[PDB]
Design a protein around this nucleic acid. Structure first.
Ligand SMILES: [Cl-]
Lengths: 118, 65, 56, 93, 92
DNA sequence: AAATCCACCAATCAACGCCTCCGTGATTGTCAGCAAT
DNA sequence: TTATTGCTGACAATCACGGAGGCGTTGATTGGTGGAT
């Protein structure tokens, strides 16, 4: 299920918002010329996070670059997902609970159960 | 030079790494072939045990017929 | 209550790795520190503040 | 969602630059060509053995699927024959 | 190795979240720190699966294909098929 | 009534990115022999 | 032997990539006040 994970635990208007983001994420990745130096998240720290596991020894220059983009999307996707809960409960302040709420919706965020059990 | 010698021993290690893997693969094919020969004989017996189980039930039904 | 069977294997593998590394760090406390670096915590106080707490 | 079918190009193969210059004598031409065949032939067999691994792996998986199907059918035949026999038995009585 | 090497910079993650939301929205120090832990785990989670597969083939180096493969193994297809596009434009 | 807590500011300096040197792989080339035909 | 091509090492030469190690230079880190929610 290649595009099954895009719309999980979401219903009605919530799916449409996330789908438009992925189609934009695709379009930008497909068309726009990428400066692989420019990143929101610094590559050094992504490599350190990886190298923190003694199991890992040597890493390619690519893997950090892929995570940087893969993370920028991951955050943006969750943060948006979480906003729907806040906006649903008439809050203009994103809370730990609003994230916790979004994470439960999809069985894709089952790895974060230890991070925010709530 | 000393660098040149660092290449010799590095290749002698590379040639040993290929010699090990070609032997490892040749052994892995023999292992898999034996494991697979056990599984095919296992199921054939299970088919025969089930097939024999039918002949019992099937000869019992014909007895009422 | 059923967790993703694809992720399951790795969630257990990580649960171990998270614990072993945490014991090696000896940070048995889950709480984050108030600040990180002394000099920046020192500089944060050093700088001239305004009427609303804004830096000059 | 919509996305084009992109294809990952393989990362540049390491090694010495393949000599572009033609050898000027046939005795060194037949040599390099025959040694090119030496490296071509040996490097291929280890890949052909990794294929031979997958050939047995896949030819066994379809066999496993066929035997695990054949016993399930012959497993139903028993349960069918068991209850059907039950129906002919108690109707004789 | 430092203690906070296992996380990413809070400011950077917080900046990405700020952009994800409207201008009028606000984010809790708690939530910023939470997201930080989640995205930091996201890396460590995937990397652990890619690494254990590397140690089967006996490859010390971990390349992009091992990450993309690790993601589809753990059920992040949309991410894996999306980063194929970024890797394919890098590789050429 | 009660409480909290987050967005405002931008200056220092930890650390990010970058280039160089060092080390380990891969792949190819070639000289000097073997090995059958 | 002589004539002829393959194959077979053994060392050397490029070529790629990963790390670690300084060395510029950036932008992450950080706290008090207001006032909303
Ligand atoms: Cl980009």
């Amino acid at each position: 299920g290649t595009w099954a994970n895009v719309n999980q635990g979401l219903q009605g208007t919530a799916r449409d918002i996330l789908t438009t983001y992925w189609q934009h994420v695709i379009n930008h990745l497909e068309s726009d010329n990428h400066d692989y130096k420019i990143h929101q998240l610094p590559l050094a720290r992504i490599k350190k996070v990886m190298k923190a596991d003694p199991e890992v020894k040597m890493i390619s220059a690519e893997a950090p670059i892929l995570f940087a983009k893969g993370c920028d999307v991951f955050i943006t996707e969750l943060t948006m997902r979480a906003w729907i809960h806040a906006e649903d409960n008439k809050r203009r302040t994103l809370q730990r609970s609003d994230i916790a709420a979004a994470l439960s919706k999809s069985d894709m965020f089952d790895f974060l159960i230890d991070i925010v059990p709530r | 030079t000393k660098r040149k010698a660092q290449n010799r021993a590095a290749q002698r290690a590379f040639r040993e790494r290929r010699a090990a893997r070609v032997s490892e693969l040749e052994d892995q094919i023999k292992k898999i072939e034996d494991d697979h020969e056990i599984h095919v004989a296992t199921f054939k017996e299970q088919i025969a045990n089930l097939s024999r189980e039918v002949e019992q039930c099937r000869t019992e039904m014909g007895w009422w017929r | 209550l059923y967790v993703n069977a694809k992720q399951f294997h790795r969630i257990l593998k990580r649960r171990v790795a998270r614990q072993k590394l945490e014991e090696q760090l000896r940070l048995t406390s889950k709480g984050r520190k108030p600040y990180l670096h002394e000099s920046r915590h020192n500089h944060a106080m050093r700088r001239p503040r305004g009427p609303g707490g804004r830096f000059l | 969602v919509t996305s084009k079918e992109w294809i990952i190009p393989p990362r540049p193969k390491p090694g010495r630059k393949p000599a572009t210059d033609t050898p000027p004598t046939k005795r060194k031409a037949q040599n390099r060509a025959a040694q090119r065949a030496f490296r071509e032939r040996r490097a291929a067999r280890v890949s052909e053995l990794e294929d031979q691994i997958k050939k047995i792996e896949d030819d066994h998986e379809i066999h496993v699927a066929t035997f695990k199907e054949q016993i399930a059918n012959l497993s139903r035949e028993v349960e069918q024959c068991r209850t059907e026999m039950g129906w002919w038995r108690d109707r004789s009585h | 190795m430092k203690e906070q090497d296992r996380w990413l910079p809070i400011a950077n993650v917080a900046r990405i979240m700020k952009l994800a939301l409207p201008e009028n929205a606000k984010i809790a120090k708690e939530a910023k720190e939470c997201m930080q832990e989640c995205v930091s785990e996201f890396i460590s989670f995937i990397t652990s699966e890619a690494s254990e597969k590397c140690q089967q083939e006996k490859r010390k180096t971990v390349n992009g294909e091992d990450i993309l493969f690790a993601m589809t193994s753990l059920g992040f297809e949309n991410y894996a098929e999306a980063l194929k596009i970024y890797l394919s434009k890098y590789r050429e």
